[PDB]
Amino acid sequence: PPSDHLEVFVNEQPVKIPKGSSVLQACDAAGIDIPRFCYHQRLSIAGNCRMCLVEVEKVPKPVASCAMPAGPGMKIKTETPMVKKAREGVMEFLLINHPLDCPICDQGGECDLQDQAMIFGSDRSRFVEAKRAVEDKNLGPLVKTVMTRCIQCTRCVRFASEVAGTAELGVTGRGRDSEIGTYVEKLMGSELSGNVVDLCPVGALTSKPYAFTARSWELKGTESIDVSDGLGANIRVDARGTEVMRILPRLNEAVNEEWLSDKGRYQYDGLKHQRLDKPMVKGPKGLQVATWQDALGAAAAALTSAAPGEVRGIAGKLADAESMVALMDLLRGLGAGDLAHEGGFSDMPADVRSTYTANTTVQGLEQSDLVLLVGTNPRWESPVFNARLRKMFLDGTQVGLVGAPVDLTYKYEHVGSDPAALAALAAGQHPFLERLKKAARPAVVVGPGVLRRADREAVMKAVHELCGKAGVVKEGWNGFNVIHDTASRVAALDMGFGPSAAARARRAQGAQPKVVYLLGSDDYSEEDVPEGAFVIYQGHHGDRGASRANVVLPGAAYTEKSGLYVNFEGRVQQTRAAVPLVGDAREDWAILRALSEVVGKRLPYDSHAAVRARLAGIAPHFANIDAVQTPVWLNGEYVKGVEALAKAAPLQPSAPLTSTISNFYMTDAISRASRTMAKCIQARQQTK
Amino acid sequence: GYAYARKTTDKDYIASEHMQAFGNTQLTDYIIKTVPKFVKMAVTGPAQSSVLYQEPTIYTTPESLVPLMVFLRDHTNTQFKCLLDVTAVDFPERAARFEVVYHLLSPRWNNRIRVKVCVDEVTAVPTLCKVFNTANWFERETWDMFGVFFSGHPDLRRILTDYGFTGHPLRKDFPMTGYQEVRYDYGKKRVVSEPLELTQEFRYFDFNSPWETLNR
Amino acid sequence: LNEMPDGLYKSPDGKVCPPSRSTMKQSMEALIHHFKLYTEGFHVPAGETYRAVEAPKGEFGVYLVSRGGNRPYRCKIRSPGYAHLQMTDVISRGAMLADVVTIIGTLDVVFGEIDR
Amino acid sequence: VVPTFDWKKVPVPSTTAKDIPVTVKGATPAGDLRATSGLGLGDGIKNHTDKWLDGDKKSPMEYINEVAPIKVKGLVVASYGSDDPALGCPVEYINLKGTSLENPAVCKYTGNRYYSDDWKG
Amino acid sequence: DKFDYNPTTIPPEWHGWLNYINDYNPTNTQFKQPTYQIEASMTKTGTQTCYNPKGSWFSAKPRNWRKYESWTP
Amino acid sequence: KRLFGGAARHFYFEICRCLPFIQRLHKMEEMVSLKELRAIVKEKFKEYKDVKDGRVVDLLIFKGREEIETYLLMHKQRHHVVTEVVEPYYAKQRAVKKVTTNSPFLDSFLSSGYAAIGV
């Protein structure tokens, strides 16, 4: 390369930077953190706040370091008298029209304007004129505006145009009367609309559900993971004692960059309603509060009095791996085999991890120049993943879709809508195959709605044939990806949480269980929980599954426990407890260990480390937290192995490949109890 | 025993020019050149005696603390007769986490100096009871608060904390409210120590700015 | 009482000293400095010092150790009565029981500064 | 192609939907989301004033609702909350264009209400 | 009150005069009277009509200060 | 022959010499005997039997000394001995092979959601 790293001088120190880097990036590589208001790493460069002004030799004016490219042998000075005078003057211009609002503003304590004024500004003002006053704007139930505090950095406009894709904000007026918003009364309709509150450096845009409730210095922050979908976005939970006050994203470039959907950000208020805090046993009066010994004894009596073939265990969408392996080992120790998952396709073969995970990974998908989506709506399954797909679209990656046509906030080519179109694509009838055959690194993304189908094996065989013909998987590149929408599904597939052959046969001839264990399940089908059965519900919210149960055992939510979750790319991540257990609830694996002791066959582990070691004994990649293995690819041997499942239950070429998520804002028991999600739905209903 | 009342008139001066110049400028180099094996590091900083000057800080090993202090007490140019205090500072990031600090005052020439020794939790520091008589209670307090053992002390016992108190409260890993609390029991008819429970737990406010430059 | 001058009674560095209450209610920089000085406080630069005052019982001194934060890293308090009470073993030798209270009274001791 | 989504056919649980905290007119549109914390939930208190006031005592919100909006000439008004600026709040500059007696503008510090007949209306 | 005299029955417009805080009383100064002003009366400490917090046994309805709602079937 | 100068057994001998005066002064004649007290103090010593550093041994002996003079000078009374020395030993040797078949895990489960802190 022709010296792809160039050398600059920052305060007489030599710094090597990549080519095309700005002056601000050279200052950052020298260990200097230049003040800024309009620059962002994820947005396009604007250059309008004038706070990043530094001095370059042989230039008589201050340059804007965010926008100015760095040339070879450049000499940058960041601490001369003109730089300090520039910083103080620009701060003084920023503060003359700002309202004296720090007591009533929610950014007070974590404000860029306050801290930068304290450090790089003066201590006085000389301004005694009247200020500019601006009326506030309505942008929906999630974003609160006090527009007198706007400093015209246009981060919101650039975000709405570039990442969210909706492009609904603009600057109206001219000069001092420039004004941010929508000209007409509109609602911010993006699923990623809470991120702009983080992007605003001031209290012009604040979070409406959070408003006036806390200051940032009072909050104990815990780094956890998000379980509202299958991506597992990295988050920080802020709590005051026993109460969670807000949820924010945190940086992870391999998973979520810096974003978080509105469901994962705003569903925390469902943790304050309908909570199970006591064990209950159903008596002649109904469910009534009982001791833990009594509730464990009743559950053990019902689990032991029934035959082993009349017991079924259903895992919920939010069950961690430790509780799932505990329930699996407890039910298998009694001679049962009927295991089911609330997220569907419980009879799916889980032999090779590459067949139900994203082999390209999330960050490795950016090296693809052509993407074919099969039967998925990524905007409602994972809006952060869809934002990364839009980022790929903006720098040249072409997108095609086989499925039901949906709004994706980027242009795509609709190849078809049914498996007949998939077969026509594999044969060669559609010209998109020649586009895939000439692509350097093609990618195929299969959504969870395909795997929920009754004919999923034939569709997966067609997808495998298409990948074989189009060079999707070859030497040096694996472009085959299967994504999920539930937090607990991949861990259950990893550990082997699946029904036995005898249990599948008994379901085929129509045997009905008498005892059902509901491990956090509230979206079960009626075929799996018969009426008149004995129901043991273990969970944290009182919902459909708890209103029907005979024994209720209160567990922990994901803000109260440290459980393992695996996302759809195969990465093992963990929650952390941000608040203690509520009431008389317990840890979720501990309930099953105590219940195995009361039944009469103890589980061989007595600690959290020991049940994690049992998980690592089943599949060794469980021990490597915050990392992803490279899964083995067995070419067409796996598809040859399951041809009996392709011959039975044949293909349905007329049923469209759709997405199963029909309610984005309410997908589980926590989001169904959230009043903010209900207001979000009501806002979209009252606009018609 | 110095600074006897000698002038019967009002004095409008502090020190002499030559000795004040020597103390405020040359004392660090003088101590380093005369006794080099005693000194391992020196800092000349913002002057314990006054806001207008500079004064030295001497770092030494525990093996030579007593000869250095005897030299600083008895040498004709450094007559540091008064030991004001002995204390410690905890630095949990270091291999030797404690810095034992000695402040001295010279009534002869209106000077002050600071002497430091770095040790960990299990290295004894020689006592200065024979050199300075106040070193007794200060070393007892330093042992009480930090757990620094002073070898050769006549009676090293705790002086400040409770009678059965194990634990050294001024360490960074010791909790502010501790582990035990105290109440009267009507059944046992005695004042009894119990594990800690708080009606309102302490609220920790994390105020620190992510733009602040001074944090070290 | 005779040489009391007219002028400022507080240092005009607004990044250390809080502003006046009329100034805080009328200028943006004063309100920002009022907000920050009453929550985070000023940051003291990293360093150390020992400073002493001729207190009415003797030399009262503070050894302040700064790492750079808005909180003291270590604050040792030197009290004169602590050193004066250490002398009671050598001062009361050869005296009688009715002179112990005279010795304690003439050392001028207060146990708040002795027992920190 | 790209069929419209019917939001009106989306189910919402009736326990959740009837418990949304909303606002009266005041400083917002009437009926938008009202921020709440967990205090008072164990005692079944959904109201702001009832969380700290007990009885039929006159609330502060009922005190400020009895003071009529004030007619101000101009386009911007400065609110101190007192005749003496030292004794009130930090000065608040409130926009007055688009305001009338029926839809006045409210100070975020004091709750006083202002309007102007000067914006060509 | 000759039998139970108490300084808590002094109104605040006489309190600063009698405590030598200012030289103002109603006989020479017209105080501004707020519409919410509660008149001064004798203290109620030692009796059962004293002030008590809202979680107290002597309240009309004691509070459980839980910050969440429990599920009732 | 005996590791680190045999200082553990010398200190144990010193405490055992000091013990009957403790029993008389604290009036523990009808509560515990000298044999069980010697066994208890011996059990305090075995907890640090795997210390590999002589300076830690010297510090532990110095701290144990200061504990024994704060017991000698009546700065901790008989109820302190009860609540800190002999009942923890009797609790560690009384709960062994209990009359119930519950594991320690299940007792902890039925007690509270979290482990106990302190004694």
Ligand code: SF4
């Ligand atoms: S944005 Fe809010 S907190 Fe920040 S300076 Fe302005 S009023 Fe104060």
Ligand code: SF4
């Ligand atoms: S609302 Fe916030 S992000 Fe948008 S222009 Fe104003 S200050 Fe910038």
Ligand code: FES
């Ligand atoms: S950060 Fe460069 S001008 Fe704003």
